[PDB]
Amino acid sequence: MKLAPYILELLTSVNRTNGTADLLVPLLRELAKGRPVSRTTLAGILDWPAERVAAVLEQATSTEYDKDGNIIGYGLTLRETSYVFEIDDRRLYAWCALDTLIFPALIGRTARVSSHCAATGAPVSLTVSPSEIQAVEPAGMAVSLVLPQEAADVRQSFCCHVHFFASVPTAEDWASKHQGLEGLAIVSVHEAFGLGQEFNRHLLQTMS
Ligand SMILES: [Br-]
Ligand SMILES: [Br-]
């Protein structure tokens, strides 16, 4: 289907005033190491004053912190979710299915991704590299999409509705009971991977 509306609103969400756009890729590569990331440490990687890191993170209200106040989660997270994202034998997590498709290209790693079907609980897994997906199991895997909401925080408006499914027909039966979500749509995991590629392409080009 025509996914331009999802690309557009996802980009608008990160390019929004005080958006995450320019800190997102450096933060994700830092979290991919598997350790908490201090705000001060992130500021030096970015060469931003502390107040700028703070304003971005303050707007990103779903950012996850540990007991020491360090960053442990923003899309990619050290805190368990339904989306397992394993790099180099380190088990990390992601906030939603589409995140697992986007991150490999941004952090330059291949991930073994696993979850369960949101409609049936069936195990699903695949290998996501910067350029391709492989070992899609089961092969007909599907993803749900919704329209990101203006100014809303991404995780409650978008992430918590963006799931893996065992198949497009299973997913479409599930969707038929959730028509109250804005712009709900079902795509194959391949089409979702293509959407994330377009997101990443716009993201990287709009980066200093
Ligand atoms: Br369209
Ligand atoms: Br995002």
mmCIF file of C-alpha atoms and ligand atoms in Angstrom:
data_model
loop_
_atom_site.group_PDB
_atom_site.id
_atom_site.type_symbol
_atom_site.label_atom_id
_atom_site.label_comp_id
_atom_site.label_asym_id
_atom_site.label_seq_id
_atom_site.Cartn_x
_atom_site.Cartn_y
_atom_site.Cartn_z
ATOM 1 C CA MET A 1 0.000 0.000 0.000
ATOM 2 C CA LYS A 2 0.943 3.683 -0.168
ATOM 3 C CA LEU A 3 3.017 4.197 2.940
ATOM 4 C CA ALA A 4 3.960 7.844 2.255
ATOM 5 C CA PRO A 5 1.577 9.006 5.073
ATOM 6 C CA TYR A 6 3.472 6.885 7.634
ATOM 7 C CA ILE A 7 6.886 7.963 6.396
ATOM 8 C CA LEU A 8 5.752 11.590 6.463
ATOM 9 C CA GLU A 9 4.354 11.547 9.995
ATOM 10 C CA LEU A 10 7.236 9.513 11.388
ATOM 11 C CA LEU A 11 9.702 12.037 9.948
ATOM 12 C CA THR A 12 7.613 14.971 11.145
ATOM 13 C CA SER A 13 7.653 13.400 14.604
ATOM 14 C CA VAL A 14 11.455 13.422 14.810
ATOM 15 C CA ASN A 15 11.951 16.689 12.886
ATOM 16 C CA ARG A 16 9.418 18.416 15.171
ATOM 17 C CA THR A 17 10.774 21.380 17.151
ATOM 18 C CA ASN A 18 13.003 19.875 19.862
ATOM 19 C CA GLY A 19 12.765 16.546 18.059
ATOM 20 C CA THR A 20 15.109 13.597 18.340
ATOM 21 C CA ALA A 21 16.403 13.700 14.731
ATOM 22 C CA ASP A 22 20.014 14.768 15.338
ATOM 23 C CA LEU A 23 20.616 12.907 18.607
ATOM 24 C CA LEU A 24 18.829 9.679 17.543
ATOM 25 C CA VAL A 25 21.564 7.911 15.584
ATOM 26 C CA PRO A 26 24.402 8.731 18.085
ATOM 27 C CA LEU A 27 22.183 7.663 21.019
ATOM 28 C CA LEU A 28 21.194 4.353 19.333
ATOM 29 C CA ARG A 29 24.815 3.454 18.573
ATOM 30 C CA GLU A 30 25.663 4.215 22.203
ATOM 31 C CA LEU A 31 22.830 2.077 23.582
ATOM 32 C CA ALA A 32 23.794 -0.753 21.189
ATOM 33 C CA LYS A 33 26.865 -1.215 23.417
ATOM 34 C CA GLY A 34 24.519 -2.629 26.055
ATOM 35 C CA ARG A 35 25.288 -0.210 28.886
ATOM 36 C CA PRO A 36 23.429 2.820 30.294
ATOM 37 C CA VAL A 37 24.353 6.119 28.625
ATOM 38 C CA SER A 38 24.770 9.228 30.736
ATOM 39 C CA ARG A 39 23.321 12.536 29.540
ATOM 40 C CA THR A 40 26.750 14.099 30.059
ATOM 41 C CA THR A 41 28.403 11.411 27.934
ATOM 42 C CA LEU A 42 25.846 11.843 25.193
ATOM 43 C CA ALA A 43 26.459 15.606 25.194
ATOM 44 C CA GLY A 44 30.146 15.146 24.457
ATOM 45 C CA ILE A 45 29.554 12.681 21.629
ATOM 46 C CA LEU A 46 27.193 15.254 20.086
ATOM 47 C CA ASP A 47 29.178 18.350 21.132
ATOM 48 C CA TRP A 48 25.949 19.926 22.330
ATOM 49 C CA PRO A 49 25.648 21.979 25.536
ATOM 50 C CA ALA A 50 23.868 20.061 28.298
ATOM 51 C CA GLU A 51 20.784 22.243 28.040
ATOM 52 C CA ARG A 52 20.247 21.194 24.403
ATOM 53 C CA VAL A 53 20.467 17.449 25.216
ATOM 54 C CA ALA A 54 18.047 18.131 28.084
ATOM 55 C CA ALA A 55 15.474 19.936 25.946
ATOM 56 C CA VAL A 56 15.369 17.145 23.363
ATOM 57 C CA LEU A 57 15.173 14.422 26.021
ATOM 58 C CA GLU A 58 12.591 16.331 28.057
ATOM 59 C CA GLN A 59 10.302 16.384 24.998
ATOM 60 C CA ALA A 60 10.942 12.697 24.405
ATOM 61 C CA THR A 61 8.849 11.816 27.428
ATOM 62 C CA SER A 62 9.062 8.032 27.043
ATOM 63 C CA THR A 63 12.870 7.984 27.379
ATOM 64 C CA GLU A 64 13.724 5.343 29.971
ATOM 65 C CA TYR A 65 16.240 5.963 32.767
ATOM 66 C CA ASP A 66 17.850 3.674 35.317
ATOM 67 C CA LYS A 67 18.358 4.167 39.080
ATOM 68 C CA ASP A 68 21.432 6.355 38.483
ATOM 69 C CA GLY A 69 19.581 8.628 36.051
ATOM 70 C CA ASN A 70 21.376 7.148 33.017
ATOM 71 C CA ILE A 71 19.600 6.571 29.676
ATOM 72 C CA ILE A 72 18.716 2.884 29.190
ATOM 73 C CA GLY A 73 16.048 3.224 26.525
ATOM 74 C CA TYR A 74 14.913 5.258 23.519
ATOM 75 C CA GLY A 75 13.513 2.958 20.808
ATOM 76 C CA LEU A 76 16.360 0.611 21.592
ATOM 77 C CA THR A 77 16.289 -0.309 25.253
ATOM 78 C CA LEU A 78 17.932 -2.387 27.956
ATOM 79 C CA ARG A 79 14.562 -2.966 29.631
ATOM 80 C CA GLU A 80 12.623 -6.026 28.567
ATOM 81 C CA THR A 81 9.903 -5.699 25.924
ATOM 82 C CA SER A 82 8.090 -8.058 23.577
ATOM 83 C CA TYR A 83 10.636 -7.230 20.850
ATOM 84 C CA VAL A 84 13.967 -8.948 21.310
ATOM 85 C CA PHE A 85 16.872 -7.387 19.427
ATOM 86 C CA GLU A 86 20.087 -9.413 19.776
ATOM 87 C CA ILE A 87 23.471 -8.052 18.516
ATOM 88 C CA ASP A 88 26.751 -9.948 18.977
ATOM 89 C CA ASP A 89 25.243 -12.239 21.637
ATOM 90 C CA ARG A 90 23.934 -9.210 23.584
ATOM 91 C CA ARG A 91 20.187 -9.341 24.150
ATOM 92 C CA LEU A 92 18.654 -5.854 23.802
ATOM 93 C CA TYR A 93 15.031 -4.820 23.225
ATOM 94 C CA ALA A 94 12.972 -2.496 21.041
ATOM 95 C CA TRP A 95 9.758 -0.571 21.540
ATOM 96 C CA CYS A 96 7.913 -1.906 18.489
ATOM 97 C CA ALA A 97 8.215 -4.118 15.446
ATOM 98 C CA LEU A 98 9.148 -1.327 13.019
ATOM 99 C CA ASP A 99 11.994 -0.180 15.328
ATOM 100 C CA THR A 100 13.621 -3.603 14.981
ATOM 101 C CA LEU A 101 13.569 -3.188 11.179
ATOM 102 C CA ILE A 102 15.062 0.346 11.240
ATOM 103 C CA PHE A 103 17.846 0.080 13.805
ATOM 104 C CA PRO A 104 20.316 -2.291 12.063
ATOM 105 C CA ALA A 105 21.033 0.238 9.265
ATOM 106 C CA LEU A 106 21.455 3.089 11.753
ATOM 107 C CA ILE A 107 23.801 1.247 14.111
ATOM 108 C CA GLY A 108 25.541 -0.727 11.322
ATOM 109 C CA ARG A 109 24.924 -4.172 12.825
ATOM 110 C CA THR A 110 22.949 -7.293 12.023
ATOM 111 C CA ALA A 111 20.356 -8.290 14.615
ATOM 112 C CA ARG A 112 18.537 -11.528 15.396
ATOM 113 C CA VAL A 113 15.021 -10.244 16.046
ATOM 114 C CA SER A 114 12.310 -12.234 17.786
ATOM 115 C CA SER A 115 8.910 -11.638 19.243
ATOM 116 C CA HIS A 116 5.467 -13.198 19.322
ATOM 117 C CA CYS A 117 2.448 -12.668 17.092
ATOM 118 C CA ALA A 118 0.184 -10.059 18.660
ATOM 119 C CA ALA A 119 -2.974 -12.007 17.542
ATOM 120 C CA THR A 120 -2.019 -15.659 18.296
ATOM 121 C CA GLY A 121 1.156 -15.683 20.467
ATOM 122 C CA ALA A 122 3.065 -17.683 17.851
ATOM 123 C CA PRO A 123 6.871 -17.228 17.969
ATOM 124 C CA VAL A 124 8.255 -15.096 15.125
ATOM 125 C CA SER A 125 11.849 -14.328 14.230
ATOM 126 C CA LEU A 126 14.033 -12.947 11.535
ATOM 127 C CA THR A 127 17.512 -11.621 10.882
ATOM 128 C CA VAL A 128 17.640 -7.899 10.069
ATOM 129 C CA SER A 129 20.756 -6.445 8.457
ATOM 130 C CA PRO A 130 21.347 -2.862 7.302
ATOM 131 C CA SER A 131 20.187 -3.804 3.769
ATOM 132 C CA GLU A 132 17.988 -6.926 3.895
ATOM 133 C CA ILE A 133 15.951 -9.245 6.039
ATOM 134 C CA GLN A 134 16.623 -13.019 6.041
ATOM 135 C CA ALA A 135 15.375 -16.195 7.791
ATOM 136 C CA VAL A 136 11.856 -14.788 8.077
ATOM 137 C CA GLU A 137 10.086 -17.373 10.242
ATOM 138 C CA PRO A 138 7.278 -17.865 9.419
ATOM 139 C CA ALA A 139 7.709 -16.535 5.895
ATOM 140 C CA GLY A 140 4.376 -14.666 5.749
ATOM 141 C CA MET A 141 5.125 -12.495 8.797
ATOM 142 C CA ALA A 142 3.142 -9.283 8.965
ATOM 143 C CA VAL A 143 3.361 -5.941 10.816
ATOM 144 C CA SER A 144 0.743 -3.489 12.005
ATOM 145 C CA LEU A 145 1.033 0.235 11.403
ATOM 146 C CA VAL A 146 -0.845 3.235 12.735
ATOM 147 C CA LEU A 147 -0.566 6.916 11.936
ATOM 148 C CA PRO A 148 1.773 8.734 14.363
ATOM 149 C CA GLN A 149 -0.015 11.560 16.153
ATOM 150 C CA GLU A 150 0.986 15.196 16.129
ATOM 151 C CA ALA A 151 3.179 16.138 19.065
ATOM 152 C CA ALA A 152 2.116 13.003 20.948
ATOM 153 C CA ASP A 153 4.932 10.921 22.387
ATOM 154 C CA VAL A 154 5.828 8.209 19.958
ATOM 155 C CA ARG A 155 5.575 5.220 22.282
ATOM 156 C CA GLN A 156 1.907 5.453 23.315
ATOM 157 C CA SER A 157 0.647 6.860 20.001
ATOM 158 C CA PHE A 158 2.655 4.649 17.658
ATOM 159 C CA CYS A 159 4.914 2.033 19.243
ATOM 160 C CA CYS A 160 2.394 0.171 21.361
ATOM 161 C CA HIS A 161 0.260 -0.483 18.214
ATOM 162 C CA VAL A 162 3.030 -1.628 15.873
ATOM 163 C CA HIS A 163 3.275 -5.407 16.304
ATOM 164 C CA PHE A 164 4.544 -8.496 14.534
ATOM 165 C CA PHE A 165 1.991 -11.067 13.333
ATOM 166 C CA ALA A 166 2.417 -14.610 12.074
ATOM 167 C CA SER A 167 0.732 -13.800 8.751
ATOM 168 C CA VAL A 168 -1.115 -11.096 6.839
ATOM 169 C CA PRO A 169 -4.473 -12.950 7.110
ATOM 170 C CA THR A 170 -4.094 -13.513 10.876
ATOM 171 C CA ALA A 171 -3.140 -9.836 11.214
ATOM 172 C CA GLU A 172 -6.059 -8.616 9.067
ATOM 173 C CA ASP A 173 -8.526 -10.556 11.237
ATOM 174 C CA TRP A 174 -6.953 -8.910 14.299
ATOM 175 C CA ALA A 175 -7.144 -5.459 12.670
ATOM 176 C CA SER A 176 -10.853 -5.861 11.943
ATOM 177 C CA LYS A 177 -11.478 -5.586 15.730
ATOM 178 C CA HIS A 178 -9.323 -2.462 16.225
ATOM 179 C CA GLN A 179 -10.697 0.015 13.667
ATOM 180 C CA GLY A 180 -10.513 2.703 16.395
ATOM 181 C CA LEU A 181 -6.790 3.190 15.791
ATOM 182 C CA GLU A 182 -5.921 6.112 13.499
ATOM 183 C CA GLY A 183 -4.807 4.831 10.112
ATOM 184 C CA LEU A 184 -4.534 1.191 11.110
ATOM 185 C CA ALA A 185 -3.014 -0.945 8.360
ATOM 186 C CA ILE A 186 -1.445 -4.383 7.902
ATOM 187 C CA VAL A 187 1.665 -4.928 5.774
ATOM 188 C CA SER A 188 4.050 -7.810 5.212
ATOM 189 C CA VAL A 189 7.295 -7.612 7.146
ATOM 190 C CA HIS A 190 9.010 -6.892 3.808
ATOM 191 C CA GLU A 191 6.849 -3.866 3.155
ATOM 192 C CA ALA A 192 7.519 -2.696 6.698
ATOM 193 C CA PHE A 193 11.231 -3.138 6.159
ATOM 194 C CA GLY A 194 10.941 -0.980 3.028
ATOM 195 C CA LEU A 195 9.142 1.722 5.003
ATOM 196 C CA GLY A 196 11.982 1.760 7.540
ATOM 197 C CA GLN A 197 14.468 2.046 4.702
ATOM 198 C CA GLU A 198 12.721 5.175 3.464
ATOM 199 C CA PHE A 199 12.624 6.561 6.976
ATOM 200 C CA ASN A 200 16.343 5.939 7.386
ATOM 201 C CA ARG A 201 17.133 7.480 4.016
ATOM 202 C CA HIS A 202 15.371 10.738 4.858
ATOM 203 C CA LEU A 203 16.874 10.606 8.347
ATOM 204 C CA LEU A 204 20.493 10.225 7.247
ATOM 205 C CA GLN A 205 20.276 12.950 4.595
ATOM 206 C CA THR A 206 18.782 15.502 7.031
ATOM 207 C CA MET A 207 21.748 14.930 9.381
ATOM 208 C CA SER A 208 24.774 17.193 9.817
HETATM 209 BR BR BR B 1 -0.570 7.867 -0.246
HETATM 210 BR BR BR B 2 10.887 7.328 16.103
#
